[PDB]
């Protein structure tokens, strides 16, 4: 099941770590390491997935956040993952991530980062 692929530790591409639990229901809870920017320790992270996705050897479609304020940091900026869960030998999940920061009105056009990360369950 997609419940049972998705739950458990996972790794990116620039060293975080990413460990969740995927509920029967459709949801996701866990925490979040960052290996780069104004990011210490773990951080709490909230998404979905989809509980029943397709048997035709599509993914999982899923999405989670994690707001970066914790019991170490606040750098005020939250960003939210959006992907696939693709099972098997070989199993990643492959995302797209908006990171955006608080900015003033002004300044508001480069609030957003997009970015990629791919997600291993062995470290790369």
Do not use: C, M
């Not at 992270?45 to 019991?71: C, E, F, I, M």
């Not at 199993?91 to 997009?114: D, Y």
């Amino acid at each position: 099941t997609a419940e049972a692929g998705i739950t458990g530790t996972w790794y990116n591409q620039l060293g975080s770590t990413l460990i969740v639990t995927a509920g029967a229901d459709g949801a996701l809870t866990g925490t979040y390491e960052s290996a780069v920017g104004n990011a210490e320790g773990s951080y709490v992270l909230t998404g979905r997935y989809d509980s029943a996705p397709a048997t035709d050897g599509s993914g999982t479609a899923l999405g989670w956040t994690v707001a970066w304020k914790n019991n170490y940091r606040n750098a005020h900026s939250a960003s939210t993952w959006s992907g696939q869960y693709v099972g098997g030998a070989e199993a990643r999940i492959n995302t797209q991530v908006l990171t955006t920061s608080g900015t003033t009105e002004a300044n508001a056009w480069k609030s957003t980062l997009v970015g990629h990360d791919t997600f291993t369950k062995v470290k790369p």
